[PDB]
Amino acid sequence: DDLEQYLDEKILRLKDEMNIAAQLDIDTLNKRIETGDTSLIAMQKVKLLPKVVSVLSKANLADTILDNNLLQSVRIWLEPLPDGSLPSFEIQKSLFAALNDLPVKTEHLKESGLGRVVIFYTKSKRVEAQLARLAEKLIAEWTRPII
């Protein structure tokens, strides 16, 4: 309960770091676009990805991850930009593999916005089939009646 506050703060700091990385990468992309300089490339998310995968993979962190809406930040990494473009394949595959192991429920999808993003992955022509089908399996599962 102070052990539980320490876990919360640790997940909340990752949540912030993920959002800062995503915003930095968007700034870089916009600059690469404005200037046409292809030596500018967004790297903040990929540098942070190993930590995100590590944390998301820890069984005893599931409750803290789910209770602190870390899936919101996961959703921000996955979500399409307004032109419809997606993060790299490596980010998609790493995040979806990590989500495959988390006990996600409808309430988390609603609160994080992840539900509508995972649905988008089931439909977008830009997504590799293996990930589109995994997205379709996960959404069915996460929203299942619960016998």
Choices 2.40.160.20, 3.40.30.10, 1.20.5.170, 3.40.50.150: CATH for 1-35: 1.20.5.170
* Domain covering 36-147: architecture: Up-down Bundle (1.20)
Sequence-ordered list of residues with C-beta below 8 angstroms from that of 134, at least 6 positions apart, any chain: 96, 100
**Residues, the chain, total?**
147
Contact of 64 with 50, CB cutoff 8 Å: no
To which H or E segment does residue 55 belong?
helix 44-56
Two structure tokens written together for 102: 């988390």
Range(s) of the chain covered by CATH 1.20.930.10: 36-147
Crossing angle of helices 70-78 and 3-35, in 10° steps, is 20
User: Would you call 145 exposed, middle or buried from its count of C-beta atoms within 10 A (0-12, 13-18, 19+)?
Assistant: exposed
- Indicate which technique resolved this structure: X-ray
How far is Cα of residue 27 from the mean position of the Cα atoms in its chain? 19
Range(s) of the chain covered by CATH 1.20.5.170: 1-35
Phi/psi zone of residue 21: left (φ > 0), alpha (ψ -120 to 50 degrees), beta? alpha
Resolution in A: 1.9
Nearest one of 47, 127, 122 to 85, comparing CA atoms: 127
Q: Looking at residue 61, what DSSP letter applies?
A: G
Contact of 15 with 73, CB cutoff 8 Å: yes
